[PDB]
Amino acid sequence: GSRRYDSRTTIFSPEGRLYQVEYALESISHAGTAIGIMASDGIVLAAERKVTSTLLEQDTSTEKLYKLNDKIAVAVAGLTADAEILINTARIHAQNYLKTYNEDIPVEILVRRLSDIKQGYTQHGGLRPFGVSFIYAGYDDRYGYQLYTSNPSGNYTGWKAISVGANTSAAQTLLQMDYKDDMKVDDAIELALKTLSKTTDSSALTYDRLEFATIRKGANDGEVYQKIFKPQEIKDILVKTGIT
Amino acid sequence: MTDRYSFSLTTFSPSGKLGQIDYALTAVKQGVTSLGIKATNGVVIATEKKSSSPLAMSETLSKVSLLTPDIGAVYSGMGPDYRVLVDKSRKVAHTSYKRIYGEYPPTKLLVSEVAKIMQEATQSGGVRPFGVSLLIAGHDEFNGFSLYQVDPSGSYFPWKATAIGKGSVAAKTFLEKRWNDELELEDAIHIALLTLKESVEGEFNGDTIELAIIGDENPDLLGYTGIPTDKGPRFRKLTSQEINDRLEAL
Amino acid sequence: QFNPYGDNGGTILGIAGEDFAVLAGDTRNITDYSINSRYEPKVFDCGDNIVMSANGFAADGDALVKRFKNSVKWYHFDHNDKKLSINSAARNIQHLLYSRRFFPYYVYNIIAGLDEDGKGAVYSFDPVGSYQREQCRAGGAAASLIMPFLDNQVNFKNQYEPGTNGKVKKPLKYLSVEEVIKLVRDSFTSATERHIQVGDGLEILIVTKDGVRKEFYELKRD
Amino acid sequence: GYDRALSIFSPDGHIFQVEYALEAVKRGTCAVGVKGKNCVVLGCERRSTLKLQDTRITPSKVSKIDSHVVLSFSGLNADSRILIEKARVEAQSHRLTLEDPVTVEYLTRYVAGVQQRYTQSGGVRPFGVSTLIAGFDPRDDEPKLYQTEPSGIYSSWSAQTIGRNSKTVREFLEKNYDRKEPPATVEECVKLTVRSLLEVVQTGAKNIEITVVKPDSDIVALSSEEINQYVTQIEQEKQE
Amino acid sequence: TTTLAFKFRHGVIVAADSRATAGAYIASQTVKKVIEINPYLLGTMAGGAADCSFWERLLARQCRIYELRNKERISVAAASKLLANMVYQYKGMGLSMGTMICGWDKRGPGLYYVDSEGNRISGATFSVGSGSVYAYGVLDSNYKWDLSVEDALYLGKRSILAAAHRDAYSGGSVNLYHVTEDGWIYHGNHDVGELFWKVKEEEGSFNNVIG
Amino acid sequence: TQQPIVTGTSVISMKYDNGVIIAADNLGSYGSLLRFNGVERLIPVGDNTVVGISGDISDMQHIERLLKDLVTENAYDNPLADAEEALEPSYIFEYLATVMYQRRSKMNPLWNAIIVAGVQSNGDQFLRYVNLLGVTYSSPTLATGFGAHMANPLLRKVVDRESDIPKTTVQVAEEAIVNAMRVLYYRDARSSRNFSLAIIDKNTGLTFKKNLQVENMKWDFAKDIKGYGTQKI
Amino acid sequence: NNYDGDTVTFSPTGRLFQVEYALEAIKQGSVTVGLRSNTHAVLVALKRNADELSSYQKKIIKCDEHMGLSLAGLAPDARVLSNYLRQQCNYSSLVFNRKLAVERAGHLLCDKAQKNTQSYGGRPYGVGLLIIGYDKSGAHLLEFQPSGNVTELYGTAIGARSQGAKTYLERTLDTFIKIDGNPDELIKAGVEAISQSLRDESLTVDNLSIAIVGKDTPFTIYDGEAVAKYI
Amino acid sequence: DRGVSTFSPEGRLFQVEYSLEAIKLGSTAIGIATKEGVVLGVEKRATSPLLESDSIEKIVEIDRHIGCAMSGLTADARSMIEHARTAAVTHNLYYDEDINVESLTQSVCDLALRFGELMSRPFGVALLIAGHDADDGYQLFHAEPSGTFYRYNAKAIGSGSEGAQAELLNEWHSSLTLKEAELLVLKILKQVMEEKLDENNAQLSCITKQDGFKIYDNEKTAELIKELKEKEAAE
Ligand SMILES: *[C@@]([C])([C][O])[C@](*)(=O)[C]([C]C1=[C][C]=[C][C]=[C]1)[N]C(=O)[C]([C]C1=[C][N]C2=C1[C]=[C][C]=[C]2)[N]C(=O)[C]([C])[N]C(=O)C1=C([C])C2=C([C]1)[C]=[C][C]=[C]2
Ligand SMILES: [Mg+2]
Ligand SMILES: [Mg+2]
Ligand SMILES: [Mg+2]
């Protein structure tokens, strides 16, 4: 019967690893690098678009940075199509919470929910897991500014600074070196771009090969603003920090 | 009986590759060339009508398809897969949008829905991926004109101009030299015909080429008068004669 | 509007002795003012020395008996031909009745046999499963005519010993099978006189350690 | 639905998927449980390969199932969340239907039953998780400490460890822990728990987590400085 | 029917009549309205005979499984709650039950009132049935915590008698139970006909009646 | 739950020494309208059973099809279908009685009253009744609807109890049935003159008589009846 | 070889190996004999024990007052199939007031076993059955194979060493068929038939199991000192 | 791979045969039936000295008149015990009586072969079911994952089973007392166990008509162990 053709996606190896999860992580390691840095007065999200073309319409393009709600955003590393499935689920979950409790969803609760969905695909159903790793950047009134990551295993952890995708080993070393606790957003912006500029596989880091976003309390009085940077605005911040 | 294939047929290999998606992209590569170019006041999509037999009436086989009055689509790869995707794309435009908001979806969101259908064929049980890449050209009020590519993985990207299928690498190079941000629609049609001639071997005329545009509103194609706000479809398929007229000034 | 219930009349009577038990019932079947049958059996040998009668709506009564007979059959299959005790049958019948709590069997059920000490046993049920063991019980159309007579002549109620004047009761001496059948026949002859749904014939089933025996007696056919 | 039998017997009478789930537990960070005379202490290892971590928001290793019971684990982190959620739901369901909080033995029996169910159900793999469940029964002052594993077997322990290098810390506990006279105070119990982790951990900085559970729903997590004082005292006595 | 139960120093007394009625007709006079759930747990029956009987036997099985699983006797509170949740499923469907779950557990003597309407109430004194209103008068006036077992058994018996006399749908005989920490003890069947005359003479009550 | 539309009236029957007789008129009434005049309400099953049906005709036609299908199904993988393992009156009845009671228990009854008349393998007479409620009974005489009120009294004068059955011949029994059908034609407003009669004998087998008429009717005394009390002319 | 992984796969010569392997389980089972006359039908079964402390596994199962069988192979599969027969016999009685024909009982078993040989996921039954009964056409004996094949016979035997008893019955055919109105002599012929399949061990009091059904004889099973008469 | 419900060429179910191998790895459990009662005993086999041995529950009550000992993958037994307890209590609900030991055993064995592609695999545990009823008296059954159950006068399951069974072959007779059976289980357990038998690593239990199913205290078993040592030293 059909058993003959079943790959058995949800089994342990003799060493106690999940085959498909490990191979999904291998896929993600070839994806464009995404970096998240948390500061005292905000969060930075930086990400590298993969070998683009001159004929790609950049200003209407979005492959890395997505908005989950007004307070929370995500950087993607892996299969974009798989990520959009999860992103829409997270957007719905955030709205369900808001409808139920009349309060914006705490960041961790949203992260746990998505991570639980990923976990399910590794334990039951016989389907391949989602080949996606997220960096969650968000704010709530309990813990303030928060950075999380999740991977196909469905395991998630909190960070002060973190990278996913390609060259994370090199990127994490550079972040661990220059990061300090009393750091500010403007400094974190500079750190993120400098780290991408050194880890990138491209010849030079340009505006057309980047997606950038900040979450700042730099909004008029006690409130939070999400800024998805435009192509011209990425070009300006590259000149300001002294990369181009 | 029962469908007992409740498991994925597309899985990650040790190298991190999704084999069936790669193989689907290979099928797209073998397919006939199709392209899309975006102008300031319009979009053009074009392809070759590769007739399987001269006894076959190639007019009955439509490679360029209307999805909504302001959105059109063309493909490269497996024709039957494209035909069912067009049926589903047309339906989802109504069920997931028009029946809710009372208006047709913007290009990017219809593309998003088509992409979702193609992603699910890449993860769901007992199915293979669609063996096609789509080029979807369209217009809407708040985003203006736009051109999107959709791949077997479900990934989609917006383009100023592009090409897919047999001679895509050469065609994309040709488009890079000719494309600028000040092109009028007629200039884009002219460039589309030049680009397409390079990939075609045999006859090159209005009967062997299929070409459609997203441009100005066509009140003559609306089918009724009396409502000022309803000005007609922006999608228009060029006739055999209309193509031949532009081949003389080529 | 369709009424799924009916009333087939009839009356039944169970009396328990010291080492025996009887279950009697008239053989008349009726609808409204018409007679369907002058002889339509209403008391059945269900097996394992148990007799049973479901009186009221005959279609529901026939179904219940049919199900209990079936329950006895499967009790043997599942438990190595073990004999179903009268107390175990009663509990089983409760669950048959309550399984239709929201569309009841419109019947009053009585079973009779011998308990595990060999003594006579009678159990009576309400239409939805409430059951109780008793020494004497009449059910059906003329139940209210017969029961007071049995309280007086079986349990010696309101009867005292002459000379004492209400100070000392009549002692509860057990009855023989011959004395019991007399009370049964007089009960049904009296009920036949004053109740229009009772008559035609009387069929009595007697249960002893030796088995199940039958006795039939005619009644007035008016 | 996906019905495939993933956990099955092999010719030698082994269920490899359950045994491979134990290998996932062996890979997991070390967890230790020690019960004193009037308390239970749960110690947990934090691997220092991950720095630049935000310790405020990172999921803690010890999880409260109810106000009087806690659960720590070793193995797949994502798998542990599913067991913890189920346990928490059952704890409230028990209070709701029986008007008493769960006993530690009951909660353990439930969690172990869930684990077992995933070893003979179609289309699912076993949990790659072993748990240590500790606490005090309602209106009781006797300490409780149980362990579970992927196969679904569970048992009570005077002291126990699970995870990577658990063989070493179990060796330490077997010679140091006396049944006739267990850790009489909280200090003695915590000290023994820290000592046991210091055999394996590496550095005694932010790598050791300690959670003390006392009777009548008195649960508290020690801070870095409080634990660091134990690490200091232990090594100063060792220099002799 | 008339049933009652009350907690006191030395446990809980449980009493009930034995009459069953089908309209004005007295169907039975020997019915058992107290139910034996376990050696330490009793349940009363009022309203639907079948309903009360079926669901409390269902509860008893539920309680027995609990003992096997947990190696521990169920509490009075948990038992009453299992019943309450069971009948709550069928609310508005036509069930008719008024019960009392009486027992001794780790918390001492326990007494819960449970009905088909959905009420579940802990209390020291309850009476349910058509004759409850007559029984309450005797209970409330004579009930104390410091009551002897002899006096407590009489109170529960005398209270049923009051109701059996006045209420047309109550009578027959009195069944008595005493629940201790060592389990429940049956204290006999007492015919109301004989009991009435005895109590009249010894107590002096019921002066209006002639005998 | 429904209401009957097109209906059939009385079915009457009785036992005699060697078999059973059953009869029913050929009318299908539509309320007070005597709509259909050629309706057969006696339906033979094999050569040993006749099922007589009263009540709703659409439900009758449904039952008629169940019985026709029952014969077909019994012959499947049955070499003794025309011999030892042929359908018995008791098998046919119990099947119908099962269906009737099941349908009433779903509150969607077959609005009929049925009499199954036949002779068993051992020569024993079979005569049993079943209706929309699943109520069953047997008696030496059986009748449905108006027949229960008017025919049974006449047939019970011939066979009052079980011991009168051997004393009753086929000529006497048929005579009684034919007289009962005349009385029903006098007194039942939903009856017809035309009827069918079936005899199932253990010796001579199944005799099915069609197109029978009520005859020897008394109407002459009507000429003398004038007015409603005081009128003389 | 490559075509025995499941029941849904024919081999290149048109064989179903999983069914043939299920057939093999019957040959490993203990011997049981069936035979009949015109008035009665008899089952004789050699029961098997695990060891001296153990009981002797029961081989004969009653289905109705007029029908029953003996098993050889997987006992749980016999419990499932006999339960199905009990239900079918019971459906026939409750609905049609009719005792189920033995031939029709065989047709129902055939069809139930067949479904397990043509569908993926399931497995064939691993047991052989000998059904006896007395119905309206007299005494009957059936042999059931889990391939689905059911056969009506005068006599037969299944299980280990069953060929010896089957040969004996083939010789005795003309004799035992005539044993009418004599249950003890028909059982004697059955006990003598099963004896031809014995090696080393002999028929003891707790080893032998006999069952009979007939004209005025309900299906009854004889075990223990009740069969000492026939030893 | 291959089906879960597949027959081998010898006519055996692969998975059932493989589960029997898992049971051979399990700790020893012994049962002896007498006219005065049935005794059940088990090897606890703690993996470490820190493990509180009294929490090891390998002897289990099903009803007041039925007990049960297990050997093999003991986690698999929990749902079998749960079903058995439910079956026993449910029958008491439907029939107002104790359930026959054989009928209870048959109910447990009906679960055994409910596996395929229902549960995904057979049970990896064997059960000794001991009890008493009025019809057949004191009984001992051995329930396997094949769905088969044999009645036994005496039976041993687990790692030291064939060695223990041979010993039970010689020692058992129809006139054994309860005390004699208790010492006999302790004797044979001590013989097949790796570690030295004491009250902490071994557990006794019995079922009598009067007192019902009882698990023995460690203090009570300790005296029976001391009584065993002295009687072996007596000759
Ligand atoms: C008092 C006598 C009256 O409240 C007392 O409550 C007793 C309680 C009791 C009796 C026997 C056993 C245990 C407890 N109650 C009865 O005697 C009731 C009276 C009653 C009938 N319906 C009802 C009652 C009380 C309160 C609500 C609803 N008797 C019964 O329950 C019995 C006799 N059942 C029936 O009479 C019938 C039922 C049930 C039923 C009938 C009659 C007909 C059709 C379907 C069901
Ligand atoms: Mg696709
Ligand atoms: Mg009259
Ligand atoms: Mg409940």
Which listed ligand is nearest to E168 at the C-alpha?
1
Q: Kindly report the CATH number assigned to the domain that includes residue E32.
A: 3.60.20.10
CA dist., res. B160 & res. B179, Å (int): 8
What string of DSSP letters covers F118-129?
EE-TTS-EEEEE
Tokens of C103: 């569309």
Cα A30 to averaged position of ligand 2 atoms, centre (Å): 21
Q: Nearest to residue H187, comparing CAs of H173, H174, H172, H175? A: H172
Q: Nearest to residue F20, comparing CAs of F148, F177, F149? A: F177
Superfamily of domain F1-233: Aminohydrolase, N-terminal nucleophile (Ntn) domain (3.60.20.10)
Q: Strand locations in E64-210, DSSP E?
A: 98-105, 108-115, 120-122, 125-128, 173-180, 183-191
Cα D227 to averaged position of ligand 1 atoms, centre (Å): 70
CA dist., res. B143 & res. E5, Å (int): 78
CA dist., res. F162 & res. F125, Å (int): 11
3 state SS of F21: strand
CA dist., res. A47 & res. A214, Å (int): 12
In the block, residue with structure tokens 């139910």: E35
State the virtual CA torsion across B189, B192, B198, B199 in degrees, nearest 10. -130
Cα A87 to averaged position of ligand 2 atoms, centre (Å): 19
Cross-chain CB nearest to D153 (options H4, H21, H74): H74
In the block, residue with structure tokens 């009781």: D140
Q: Which residue of D has its CA nearest to E83?
A: D97
Residues in chain E followed by a break, C to N above 2.5 angstroms:
none
CA dist., res. C196 & res. C221, Å (int): 10
**How close A4 comes to chain H (CA, Å)?**
7
CA dist., res. G77 & res. G71, Å (int): 9
CA dist., res. B140 & res. B103, Å (int): 11
- Torsions phi, psi for E180 (to 5 deg): -110, 175
Cα A153 to averaged position of ligand 2 atoms, centre (Å): 24
3 state SS of F201: strand
**How close A124 comes to chain G (CA, Å)?**
20
Q: Count of domains in chain C?
A: 1
Angle (nearest 5°) at CA H188 between H183 and H189: 95
3 state SS of F219: coil
Provide CB contacts within 8 A for A91, sequence distance 6+: A68, A69
In the block, residue with structure tokens 């009687």: H231
Provide CB contacts within 8 A for A99, sequence distance 6+: none
- Pairing between β-strand E183-191 and β-strand E11-16 as defined by DSSP bridges: unpaired
CA dist., res. C59 & res. C62, Å (int): 5
Contact call for residues G197 and G43 (beta carbons, < 8 A):
no
Tokens of A212: 């950038």
**How close D95 comes to chain E (CA, Å)?**
10
Alpha helices (H) along chain G? 17-28, 75-96, 102-118, 162-176, 183-194
- Torsions phi, psi for E100 (to 5 deg): -130, 125
DSSP, res F109: -
- Torsions phi, psi for H61 (to 5 deg): -85, 130
**Which residue minimizes the CA distance to atom 41 of ligand 1?**
C127
Resolution of the model in angstroms: 2.7
A5 touches G at CB < 8 Å? no
Window 72-111 of G: residues touching F by CB (8 A cutoff) are: 94-98, 101, 103-104, 107
Maximum separation of any 2 CA atoms in chain H, in Å: 60
Which residues in chain G are contacts of H108 at CB distance < 8 A? none
Start-to-end Cα distance in chain G: 46
Taking each helix axis as running N to C, give the angle between helix F170-187 and helix F146-155, from 0 to 180 degrees, rounded to the nearest 10: 140
CA dist., res. E57 & res. E64, Å (int): 11
Amino acid at B222: L
3 state SS of H207: strand
Tokens of C70: 């079936």
F141-164 residues labelled b (16+ CB within 10 A) or e (exposed): bbbbbbbbbbbbebbbebbeeeeb
Q: Kindly report the CATH number assigned to the domain that includes residue A119.
A: 3.60.20.10
Rg of chain B on CA atoms, in Å: 19
Which sign, positive or negative, has the C-alpha torsion D206, D209, D210, D213? positive
Q: Which residue of D has its CA nearest to H116?
A: D5
C164 touches H at CB < 8 Å? no
Tokens of H206: 């019995």
3 state SS of E19: coil
Cα atoms in the 13 Å half-sphere on the side-chain side of G75: 20
H/E segment holding residue C31: strand C29-31
**Which residue minimizes the CA distance to atom 7 of ligand 1?**
E1
Q: Strand locations in chain F, DSSP E?
A: 6-8, 11-16, 19-25, 28-30, 33-36, 42-44, 49-56, 112-119, 125-131, 136-138, 141-143, 194-201, 205-213
Active site residues of E: 1
How many residues appear in chain H? 235
Tokens of A172: 């994490």
Contact call for residues E46 and E56 (beta carbons, < 8 A):
no
Asked if H49's CB is within 8 angstroms of D116's CB, the reply is no
CA dist., res. B233 & res. B68, Å (int): 8
Amino acid at E107: R
Q: Kindly report the CATH number assigned to the domain that includes residue C37.
A: 3.60.20.10
Cα E49 to averaged position of ligand 1 atoms, centre (Å): 5
Q: Kindly report the CATH number assigned to the domain that includes residue D29.
A: 3.60.20.10
H12 touches G at CB < 8 Å? yes
Q: Is the CB of residue E42 below 6 angstroms from any atom belonging to ligand 1? A: no
E53 touches H at CB < 8 Å? no
Provide CB contacts within 8 A for B63, sequence distance 6+: B34, B47, B49, B74, B75, B79, B82, B210
Tokens of D232: 């200091």
3 state SS of E139: helix
Contact call for residues B236 and B212 (beta carbons, < 8 A):
yes
Tokens of B22: 């790669």
Alpha helices (H) along D51-103? 77-98
Which residues in chain C are contacts of G69 at CB distance < 8 A? none
Q: Is the CB of residue E19 below 6 angstroms from any atom belonging to ligand 1? A: yes
How many residues appear in chain D? 240
Q: Is F4 exposed, middle or buried (0-12, 13-18, 19+ CB in 10 A)?
A: middle
D76-95 residues labelled b (16+ CB within 10 A) or e (exposed): bbbbbbbbbeebbebbeebe
3 state SS of G23: helix
CA dist., res. A53 & res. G107, Å (int): 73
Which listed ligand is nearest to C126 at the C-alpha?
1
Provide CB contacts within 8 A for A56, sequence distance 6+: A208, B157, B158, B159, B160
Give the determination technique. X-ray
Q: Nearest to residue C29, comparing CAs of F105, F120, F91, F131? A: F131
In the block, residue with structure tokens 């005065």: H36
CA dist., res. E91 & res. D50, Å (int): 57
CA dist., res. C172 & res. E191, Å (int): 15
B53 touches D at CB < 8 Å? no
| Beta-ladder partners of F85 | none
CA dist., res. H44 & res. H28, Å (int): 8
Q: Nearest to residue C130, comparing CAs of E85, E93, E55, E64? A: E55
CA dist., res. G90 & res. G107, Å (int): 16
* Three-state SS sequence of chain A: CHHHHCCCCCCECCCCCEHHHHHHHHHHCCCCCEEEEEECCEEEEEEECCCCCCCECCCCCCCCEEECCCCEEEEEEECHHHHHHHHHHHHHHHHHHHHHHCCCCCHHHHHHHHHHHHHHHHHECCCCCCCEEEEEEEEECCCEEEEEEECCCCCEEEECEEEECCCHHHHHHHHHHHCCCCCCHHHHHHHHHHHHHHHCCCCCCCHHHEEEEEEECCCCCCCCEEEECCHHHHHHHHHHHCCC
Start-to-end Cα distance in chain E: 26
Tokens of F126: 């079979």
Q: Count of domains in chain D?
A: 1
- The residue whose CB lies within 8 Å of the most ligand 1 atoms, and thus the one to mutate among E4, E21, E132, E174, is E21
Taking each helix axis as running N to C, give the angle between helix D166-176 and helix D186-198, from 0 to 180 degrees, rounded to the nearest 10: 140
Provide CB contacts within 8 A for E1, sequence distance 6+: E16, E17, E19, E33, E45, E46, E47, E128, E129, E130, E131, E169, E170
Where do the structural domains in chain B lie, given as residue ranges? Answer: 1-250
Rg of chain D on CA atoms, in Å: 18
Q: Nearest to residue B116, comparing CAs of B89, B135, B77? A: B89
Q: Count of domains in chain H?
A: 1
Which residues in chain A are contacts of D55 at CB distance < 8 A? 158
Q: Strand locations in chain E, DSSP E?
A: 3-8, 11-16, 20-22, 25-28, 34-38, 41-44, 98-105, 108-115, 120-122, 125-128, 173-180, 183-191
Alpha helices (H) along H61-100? 77-95
CA dist., res. A197 & res. G170, Å (int): 95
H9 touches C at CB < 8 Å? no
Q: Is F198 left (phi over 0), alpha (psi -120 to 50) or beta?
A: beta
Q: Is the CB of residue C143 below 6 angstroms from any atom belonging to ligand 1? A: no
Residue D101 CB neighbours (<10 A)? 21
Amino acid at D113: G
Cα F115 to averaged position of ligand 3 atoms, centre (Å): 24
Amino acid at D191: K
CA dist., res. H231 & res. H217, Å (int): 22
Where do the structural domains in chain G lie, given as residue ranges? Answer: 1-231
CA dist., res. G132 & res. G43, Å (int): 7
For G1-231, the fitting CATH number among 3.60.20.10, 3.10.580.10, 1.10.3720.10, 3.40.50.620 is: 3.60.20.10
Range of E201's domain?
A: 1-211
| Beta-ladder partners of A214 | A44, A227
> Binding site membership of E for bortezomib: which residues?
49
Q: Count of domains in chain E?
A: 1
The third-level CATH classification (topology) of the domain covering B1-250 is Glutamine Phosphoribosylpyrophosphate, subunit 1, domain 1 (3.60.20)
DSSP, res C146: H
Contact call for residues F73 and F122 (beta carbons, < 8 A):
no
Which residues in chain H are contacts of E64 at CB distance < 8 A? 89, 92
Contact call for residues E101 and E76 (beta carbons, < 8 A):
yes
Asked if G94's CB is within 8 angstroms of C66's CB, the reply is yes
Start-to-end Cα distance in chain A: 61
Query: What count of CB pairs under 8 Å joins C to H?
Result: 26
Q: Is the CB of residue E133 below 6 angstroms from any atom belonging to ligand 1? A: no
Tokens of A122: 């590794």
Chain-centre distance for alpha carbon G118: 24
Range of D93's domain?
A: 1-240
Tokens of C123: 């159990």
Q: Which residue of D has its CA nearest to E86?
A: D97
Q: Which residue of D has its CA nearest to B6?
A: D2
Alpha helices (H) along F132-169? 146-155
Q: Is C3 exposed, middle or buried (0-12, 13-18, 19+ CB in 10 A)?
A: exposed
Tokens of D4: 């495939």
3 state SS of C133: strand
CA dist., res. D28 & res. D163, Å (int): 5
Which listed ligand is nearest to B121 at the C-alpha?
2
Asked if E69's CB is within 8 angstroms of H85's CB, the reply is yes
Provide CB contacts within 8 A for E151, sequence distance 6+: none
3 state SS of F96: helix
Taking each helix axis as running N to C, give the angle between helix G75-96 and helix H101-112, from 0 to 180 degrees, rounded to the nearest 10: 100
Asked if G86's CB is within 8 angstroms of C70's CB, the reply is no
Q: Nearest to residue E53, comparing CAs of C60, C138, C89, C91? A: C91
Q: Nearest to residue G68, comparing CAs of G105, G104, G26? A: G105
Provide CB contacts within 8 A for G114, sequence distance 6+: G148
Amino acid at E167: D
Contact call for residues A173 and A154 (beta carbons, < 8 A):
no
